[PDB]
From Swiss-Prot, chain A:
Belongs to the glutamate-gated ion channel (TC 1.A.10.1) family. GRIK5 subfamily. It comes from Rattus norvegicus. High expression in the cerebral cortex, pyriform cortex, caudate-putamen, hippocampal complex, medial habenulata and granule cell layer of the cerebellum. Weak expression in globus pallidus, thalamus, colliculi and the reticular thalamic nucleus. Expressed at high levels in the trigeminal ganglion neurons. This is Glutamate receptor ionotropic, kainate 5. It is found in: Cell membrane; Postsynaptic cell membrane; Presynaptic cell membrane. The chain holds residues 152 to 201 of 979 of the full protein. Disulfide bonds join 14-19. Ionotropic glutamate receptor that functions as a cation-permeable ligand-gated ion channel, gated by L-glutamate and the glutamatergic agonist kainic acid. Cannot form functional channels on its own and produces channel activity only in heteromeric assembly with GRIK1, GRIK2 and GRIK3 subunits. It comes from the Eukaryota. Homotetramer. Heterotetramer with GRIK2. Can form functional heteromeric receptors with GRIK1, GRIK2 and GRIK3.
UniProtKB/Swiss-Prot annotation, chain B:
It comes from Rattus norvegicus. Belongs to the glutamate-gated ion channel (TC 1.A.10.1) family. GRIK2 subfamily. It is found in: Cell membrane; Postsynaptic cell membrane. The gene is Grik2. The chain holds residues 101 to 149 of 908 of the full protein. Highest expression is found in the olfactory lobe, piriform cortex, dentate gyrus, hippocampus, granular cell layer of the cerebellum, and in caudate-putamen. This is Glutamate receptor ionotropic, kainate 2. Ionotropic glutamate receptor that functions as a cation-permeable ligand-gated ion channel, gated by L-glutamate and the glutamatergic agonist kainic acid. L-glutamate acts as an excitatory neurotransmitter at many synapses in the central nervous system. Binding of the excitatory neurotransmitter L-glutamate induces a conformation change, leading to the opening of the cation channel, and thereby converts the chemical signal to an electrical impulse. The receptor then desensitizes rapidly and enters a transient inactive state, characterized by the presence of bound agonist.
Amino acid sequence: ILKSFNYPSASLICAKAECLLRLEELVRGFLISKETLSVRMLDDSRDPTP
Amino acid sequence: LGVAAIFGPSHSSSANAVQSICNALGVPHIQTRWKHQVSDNKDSFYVSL
């Protein structure tokens, strides 16, 4: 879908660490960076505003 | 046989099974190698080294 968006600078937000396994093919298929894909994960209190 | 703590194993899936057999029964599971910990595991009865 991203390649049909011409690979814009994404930002995966994963609720739990298991996302990195659930989406391993996407994370390792990209170049993790500030301008390509940055994986930010929700914390303990589950407040996503920061 | 009656034990006091159950060390090992080393693989992640086998380690997780023994860790919940213990967390249930209440004897300490004292691991040695890193395992894939599930994020919602409410097991109080295990100790990693």
